[PDB]
Amino acid sequence: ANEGDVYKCELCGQVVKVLEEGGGTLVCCGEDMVKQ
Amino acid sequence: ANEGDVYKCELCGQVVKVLEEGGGTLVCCGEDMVKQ
Numbered sequence: 001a002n003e004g005d006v007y008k009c010e011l012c013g014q015v016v017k018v019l020e021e022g023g024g025t026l027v028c029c030g031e032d033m034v035k036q
Numbered sequence: 037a038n039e040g041d042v043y044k045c046e047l048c049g050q051v052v053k054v055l056e057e058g059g060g061t062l063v064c065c066g067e068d069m070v071k072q
């Protein structure tokens with residue numbers, strides 16, 4: 001995921017912003033977070 | 037996790053900031069992200 005991108009977890013509504021780019025896929029509540 | 041908290045994944049170094057608080061645990065590269 002890229003720096004600055006925002007991801008949301010549709011199961012609990014937690015939203016996070018990427019500060020440092022990395023190669024792994026963001027997961028929350030066992031499900032892939034959705035890129036906003 | 038709380039709003040404003042910063043999480044890092046030790047396996048790929050991706051860092052994210054919590055914009056909206058949620059009850060799920062943040063995961064990346066299959067592992068729990070570490071609270072900074």
Ligand SMILES: [Hg+2]
Binds near residue numbers: 023024025047048064
């Ligand atoms: Hg990761």
Ligand SMILES: [Hg+2]
Binds near residue numbers: 061
């Ligand atoms: Hg979640």
